């Protein structure tokens, strides 16, 4: 079911098996590195396996978590095959420890062997101005359409402005719950009888 | 406005589009004075005992030449992660190694720590494309690889730089290195021992040790190298005035 869906939830929770497959996972996670933060072991328990059999993951990471979000991945059953820049700027085009941060990574990430996927369309760096906290770029949507055309994906820990069509967004500042495909409604009925 | 969208419209890439690539410091005069002569080396790093070039150092710079850079010897994560770095690092020291954009970015991960280092800054060489608005993309790749990346780690216990590098894709068969990189590290004011591996002789730099195998010519002695750290310039951070 084509229109925006959302589940306001506690990732750690909830029994993603009831979602199916999809062709993409994103997941812009609370790295422990505090608000709504998972640790280590909290985010390397997460059931991201049972998400997908063939098809990509997006993992955007920071700090050290540059390599605690590479074992997840690892762990999760995926090959770093990509990594995407944000190189962040303000209106005017322009740039906005050691070195002053200019920029954010998404590890990219696959999975079995995917098939009918439009790869080497975009190119790894993404240049957009910075809007909310924690707000990664729209373009990553478009970037994801293009690549894995109609198909269905799923973002964790998304906010209300991250629902989009195709997708099913999950995270804890939604605002309740909201699904369409007739597949995973039934699921939900049969796992969850009262919410 | 969506440059990605462009991107796939035109063949421009995204940063393109960045634009400025008040108050002045310029302390690299600092730099430049303490700077030591520069000294050279050929040598295969393959066969070459590493452990020969003393003392030890407060700043490496690793460029071994990758496969993926050629699309007279290509070096593998097998080759380089056998490297006996940490023979040579200080114990107080800092490696600046170029990745690539492929297996490099874990693999290099790999490498800094089998050698004792941590992670503390990932420097991203970002090419525009503005003199020609699609190479081989290699058989993993899920995007057009448009950038490269410098891992800096640190092992051991001001902020003038930022972590880009944004300068115009090179020809191909070119495999050199945006000089920039030398002067974020510079800016540092790290230690005065700097060992560039696999440098060339258009690389070589004041400050700088510089080993390779298609180095011409050599000036390197091992005394005369150790003469300008001995005292009273030890720890000298390279950022200092003359004693
Ligand atoms: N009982 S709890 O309040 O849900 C709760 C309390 C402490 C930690 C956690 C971690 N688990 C999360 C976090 C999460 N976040 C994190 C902050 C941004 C937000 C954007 O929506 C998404 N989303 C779903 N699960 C949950």
């Known amino acids: 079911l084509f229109p925006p869906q959302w589940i306001c939830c506690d990732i750690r929770y909830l029994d993603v098996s009831i979602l199916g497959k999809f062709a993409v996972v994103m997941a812009d996670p609370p790295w422990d590195i505090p608000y709504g933060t998972l640790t280590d072991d909290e985010m390397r328990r997460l059931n991201i396996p049972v998400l997908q059999d063939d098809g990509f993951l ?24 990509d990594e995407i820049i944000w190189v962040k700027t303000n209106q005017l085009q322009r740039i906005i420890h050691w070195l002053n941060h200019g920029k954010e990574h998404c590890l990219v990430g696959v999975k079995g062997n995917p098939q009918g996927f439009n790869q080497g369309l975009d190119c790894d760096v993404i240049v957009a101005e910075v809007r909310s906290t924690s707000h990664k770029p729209d373009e990553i949507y478009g970037m994801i359409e293009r690549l894995s055309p109609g198909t269905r994906k799923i973002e964790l820990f998304g906010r209300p402005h991250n629902v989009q069509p195709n997708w099913i967004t999950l995270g804890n500042q939604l605002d309740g719950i909201h699904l369409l495909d007739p597949d995973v409604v039934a699921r939900f009925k049969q796992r969850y009888p009262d919410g | 406005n969506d440059y990605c969208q462009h991107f796939v419209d035109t063949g421009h890439r995204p940063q393109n589009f960045i634009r400025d690539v008040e108050l002045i410091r310029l302390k690299d005069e600092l730099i430049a004075k303490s700077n030591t002569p520069p000294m050279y080396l050929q040598a295969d790093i393959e066969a070459f005992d590493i452990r020969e070039l ?45 990745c690539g954009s492929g297996e490099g970015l874990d693999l290099g991960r790999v490498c800094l720590r089998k050698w004792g280092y941590r992670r ?68 540092f004011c790290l230690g005065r021992r700097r060992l560039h591996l696999f440098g060339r002789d258009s690389t070589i730099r004041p400050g700088w040790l510089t080993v390779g195998p298609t180095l011409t010519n050599s000036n390197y002695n091992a005394e005369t190298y150790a003469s300008y750290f001995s005292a009273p310039n030890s720890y000298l951070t390279g950022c200092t005035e003359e004693i």
């Open chain 2, 54 to 98: 003393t003392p030890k150092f407060d700043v490496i710079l690793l460029e071994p030449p990758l496969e993926e850079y050629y699309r007279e010897k290509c070096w593998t994560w097998d080759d380089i992660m056998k490297l006996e770095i940490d023979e040579i690092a200080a114990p107080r020291s800092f490696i600046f190694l170029w």
């Open chain 1, 58 to 81: 997006f993992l955007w990471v920071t700090g050290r978590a540059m390599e605690l979000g590479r074992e997840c991945l690892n762990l999760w059953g995926y090959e770093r095959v």
């Open chain 2, 120 to 187: 503390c800054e990932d420097i991203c060489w970002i090419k525009t494309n503005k003199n020609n608005p699609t190479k081989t993309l290699d058989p993993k790749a899920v995007f057009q690889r448009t950038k490269e990346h410098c891992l800096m780690g640190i092992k051991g216990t001001a902020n003038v730089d930022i972590d880009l590098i944004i300068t115009e894709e090179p020809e191909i068969g070119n495999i050199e290195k945006p000089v920039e990189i030398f002067h974020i590290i510079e800016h």
